[PDB]
């Protein structure tokens, strides 16, 4: 069962849009009940996966912190599989993992740019979802290495299709959103429409959802290529158009991916995960 009412109570957070026009929740510190959710999901033998790519120098100075922090804050108390797509392998750090954590590594072909590093990422993720991830996990999360888990990034984050709110553009409104306005691009979003500006550093859902996500972002990135057009913010733009045309069932708040470069407004009480510098 489990109704939105069982774990989420908006009236707990300082009027900062906890619901959306499609009745979806926006998880903010103090509006979720981990306690309940943990039990609910444990009783279901739920296991969560996390894909992370690291090519070139990134692996050298980001991967370790990512993995070390994730192993300490991500879905603690629940079966987690880390899928590490790397270009080298002979270089990646084997950090010790704790209870309910395990992983597998994958050697991925580098290309350097975005029309690659970021284009293939979408193709690769789907290829893997269909190949094995769908059979190994109940909920999948795709993220960027250059991030760092700061505190419990628990199961209140789960959902059929989860989206992150870009830390910067969340106060702003649709017409200031850096969508792709060149109507010649597939990630094109007019100037009237627009719900939120989602971050490409975090997005998840069920394997099936993520598959459709990556798949659509890829076929679109691929299309812009055969069109000599490169959407600004590459993957982020296509994603943003997908989430506009396929509303997420759950939006996380800037607290789940915060940029400390912005400081720390009272709107942000507990930082689950920040940007790496």
Q: Kindly provide the residue ranges of all beta strands, DSSP E only, lying in 134-218, ordered along the sequence.
A: 139-144, 147-149, 161-165, 198-205
Angle of CA points 211, 199, 64, to nearest 5°: 85
Which residues, 6 or more positions from 35, have their beta carbon under 8 angstroms from its beta carbon?
none
Closest residue by Cα to residue 181 from 132, 233, 106, 228: 233
Per the annotation, does 267 bind a ligand?
no
Helices marked H in the chain: 4-7, 34-42, 57-58, 64-73, 119-128, 134-136, 207-225, 234-245
Per the annotation, does 187 bind a ligand?
no
Which residues, 6 or more positions from 220, have their beta carbon under 8 angstroms from its beta carbon?
186, 187, 238, 241, 242
Residue 157 is classified by DSSP as G
CA pair distance 109, 90, nearest whole angstrom:
14
Helix, strand or coil for residue 213? helix
CATH code for the domain defined by 1-277: 3.90.550.10
Q: Is 15 a catalytic residue?
A: no
Experimental approach taken: X-ray
CA pair distance 181, 193, nearest whole angstrom:
11
Q: How many residues can be counted in the chain?
A: 277
**What residues does 74 pair with on adjacent strands?**
153
DSSP string covering 2-58 = --HHHHB-GGGSSSS--B-TTS-BEE-TTSB-HHHHHHHHHTTT--EEEEEEE-THH
Closest residue by Cα to residue 249 from 6, 17, 71, 27: 27
Could you give the count of Cα atoms lying within 13 Å of 122 in the half-sphere of its Cβ? 26
Phi, psi for 30 (deg, rounded to 5)? 100, 5
Per the annotation, does 22 bind a ligand?
no
Catalytic residue among 156, 180, 216, 236: 236
Domain-wise residue ranges, the chain: 1-277
**What residues does 203 pair with on adjacent strands?**
142, 163
Helices marked H in 119-181: 119-128, 134-136
CA pair distance 193, 85, nearest whole angstrom:
35
Cβ atoms of 237 and 147 closer than 8 Å: no
CA pair distance 164, 154, nearest whole angstrom:
15
CA pair distance 146, 223, nearest whole angstrom:
28
Q: Which tokens go with 67?
A: 């993995």
Per the annotation, does 53 bind a ligand?
yes
Closest residue by Cα to residue 39 from 5, 6, 69, 4: 6
CA pair distance 27, 8, nearest whole angstrom:
8
**What residues does 32 pair with on adjacent strands?**
8
């Amino acid at each position: 069962k489990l109704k939105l009412s069982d774990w989420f109570n908006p009236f707990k957070r300082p009027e900062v849009v906890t619901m959306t026009k499609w009745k979806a929740p926006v998880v903010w510190e103090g509006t979720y009940n981990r306690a309940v959710l943990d039990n609910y999901y444990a009783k279901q033998k739920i296991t969560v996966g996390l894909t992370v790519f690291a090519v070139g120098r990134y692996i050298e100075h980001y991967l370790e912190e990512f993995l070390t922090s994730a192993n300490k804050h991500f879905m603690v108390g629940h079966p987690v599989i880390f899928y590490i797509m790397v270009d080298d392998v002979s270089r990646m750090p084997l950090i010790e993992l704790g209870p309910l954590r395990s992983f597998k590594v994958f050697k991925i072909k580098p290309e350097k740019r975005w029309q690659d590093i970021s284009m293939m990422r979408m193709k690769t993720i789907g290829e893997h979802i269909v190949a094995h991830i769908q059979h190994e996990v109940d909920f999948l999360f795709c993220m960027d290495v250059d991030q760092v888990f700061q505190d419990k990034f628990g199961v209140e984050t789960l959902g059929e299709s989860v989206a992150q709110l870009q830390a910067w553009w969340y106060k702003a409104d649709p017409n200031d959103f850096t969508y792709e306005r060149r109507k010649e691009s597939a990630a094109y979003i007019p100037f009237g429409e627009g719900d939120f500006y989602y971050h490409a550093a975090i997005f998840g859902g069920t394997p099936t959802q993520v598959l459709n996500i990556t798949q659509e972002c890829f076929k679109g990135i691929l299309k812009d290529k055969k069109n000599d057009i490169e959407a600004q913010w590459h993957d982020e733009s296509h994603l943003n158009k997908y989430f506009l045309l396929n509303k997420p069932t759950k939006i996380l708040s800037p607290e789940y991916c915060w940029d400390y470069h912005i400081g720390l407004p009272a709107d942000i009480k507990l930082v689950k995960m920040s940007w790496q510098t």
